[PDB]
Write a protein that binds this ligand. Sequence first.
Ligand SMILES: CNC(=O)Cn1cc(-c2cc3c(N[C@H](c4ccc5c(c4)S(=O)(=O)CCC5)C(C)C)ncnc3[nH]2)cn1
Length: 167
Amino acid sequence: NSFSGYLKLTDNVYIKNADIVEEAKKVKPTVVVNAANVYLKHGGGVAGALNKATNNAMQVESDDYIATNGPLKVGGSCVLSGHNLAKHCLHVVGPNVNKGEDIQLLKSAYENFNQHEVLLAPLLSAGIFGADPIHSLRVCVDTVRTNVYLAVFDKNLYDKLVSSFLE
Ligand SMILES: CNC(=O)Cn1cc(-c2cc3c(N[C@H](c4ccc5c(c4)S(=O)(=O)CCC5)C(C)C)ncnc3[nH]2)cn1
């Protein structure tokens, strides 16, 4: 868990302008969070990037999990292998508001983080999931009580998020 160059926002929430994949390779965290969908199809964005860094081993393991257990719910999660990126991957489904899912489920999505002491994570429901990223950071700070290191791969968004937190 050798996180470097993060800015501490609260006693348990840290943030960095970084690619989560590159952070996972450098840090070797105990848990890396995936911004998953309910059938664990890692077809693009953050999930596609984490899967590609495992050379597709994450997708094969995810398909086997879904075959035995069925899909996740929106706001839910499952723990699978971290492969070469972490000890464990926590696959968390935040709401996709561009697809009509309720933004209120973002609190349930972050609540999954509280079962793990230390996590490297992306900003849930941001990007093409359509949630307002400043609102996602607020829900994270209000909901997560364990130690979370957020990697946001965009300096423009990073700067807006830090400015919003420090108002
Ligand atoms: C040349 N191809 C590539 O760059 C592929 N490639 C993408 C990455 C990569 C993207 C990324 C990231 N993006 C942020 C984000 C946060 C949450 C969600 C999304 C996006 S989404 O995937 O659109 C939908 C699910 C929720 C946005 C807001 C800057 N945040 C951290 N680490 C990240 N790593 C590496 N590689």
